[PDB]
Amino acid sequence: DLGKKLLEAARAGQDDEVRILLANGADVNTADETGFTPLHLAAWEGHLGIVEVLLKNGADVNANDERGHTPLHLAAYTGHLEIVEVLLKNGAGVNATDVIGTAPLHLAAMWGHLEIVEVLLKNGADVRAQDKFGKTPKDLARDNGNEWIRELLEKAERKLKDLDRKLLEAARAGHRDEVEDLIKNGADVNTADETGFTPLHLAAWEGHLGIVEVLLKNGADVNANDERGHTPLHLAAYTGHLEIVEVLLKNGAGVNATDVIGTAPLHLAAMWGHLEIVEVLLKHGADVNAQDKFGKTPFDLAIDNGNEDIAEVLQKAA
């Protein structure tokens, strides 16, 4: 019974009653049938004093209702700026998503709460977050005619695109500290250039081992395909970067991936004379019988190109 009274007092804005109920043992994190806590209801109705009292007494700032909405979602939707600021100060998750993929920034942008948008952005909100329909917050601002917010979010996305371009260049050039700084300031490790090369492609091609490792640790797709089907492992096998081959395989690289010509990493290592790489690829399950579009196996290429030691290794594995 205490829990129900606290929910109602919080919803009704009964500041004195909230304090008494808490003093008498009401559970600050009690939840109604749909998972709303007193903090949800105070944030939704705009009762700043009660929000602060609930947080002072142990309220879970990131409590989820049964569909994933947090108190920050509700304050962002209803446009309660000071409550947004208090929630964030008490640890609210600025990028939390409900079961539809909707984050607080989606709601502030859709419902035209500019100062809340600006506060969410200052607190780390992700302008690239897409809901289940594929909408970013900018998309919703545009669709709903909130042009000032749309323009603000467009500028923010253009700054991230610039960071993405610098990340490609730093990864190609081997500037490790620049790579790490760019990732920390929000560069997308899975960005790709016009031909489909990602930072991981460029680092593997240029033999930048440390950068390969940093990119994979920050979530880079080990099996990303460029526009012709080449993966990072293709490029490391071609250029002969043995340690990078081993890191890629350790991180899940597909050992038998083929480009649009049917060329696999083993073809490239055998053709270009990289014996240790051939051996590592065989150890990880490379397919000696794979034929490219010309009908050539890796053994065929080793024979055609005079790589006798490799030809013998591949016959042993026939």
Numbering used by the authors: 13 to 330
Paper text:
In this paper, we present a strategy to fuse specific, high-affinity protein binders to obtain multivalent or multispecific scaffolds of predetermined geometry. DARPins are used as building blocks to confer the desired specificity to the construct. A series of rigid connector modules replacing the DARPin capping repeats allow to combine the individual DARPin domains in such a way that their distance and angle can be altered to test different geometries, bringing the binding partners of the DARPins into a defined spatial arrangement. The two helices are not just joined end-to-end, but instead the two domains are made to overlap in such a way that the joining helix is stabilized by contacts with the domain cores along its entire length.
In the context of DARPin-β-lactamase fusions, we observed that the paratope of this DARPin has a high propensity to form major crystal contacts, leading to crystal formation under a wide variety of conditions. Indeed, constructs D12_Hxx_D12 with H02, H09, H11, H13 and H15 yielded diffraction-quality crystals in space groups P212121, P6122, P212121, C2 and P1, respectively, at resolutions ranging from 1.8 Å to 3.5 Å. Indeed, in the majority of the D12-containing structures analyzed in this study, the D12 paratope-paratope interaction provided the largest crystal contact, with a total of around 1700 Å2 of solvent-accessible surface buried in the interface. D12_H15_D12 makes paratope-paratope contacts of this type both within the asymmetric unit and with symmetry-related molecules. Five out of nine DD structures showed good agreement between design and experimental crystal structure with root mean squares deviation (rmsds) of the Cα atoms below 2 Å. This confirms the design strategy and validates the concept of a shared helix as a rigid connector.
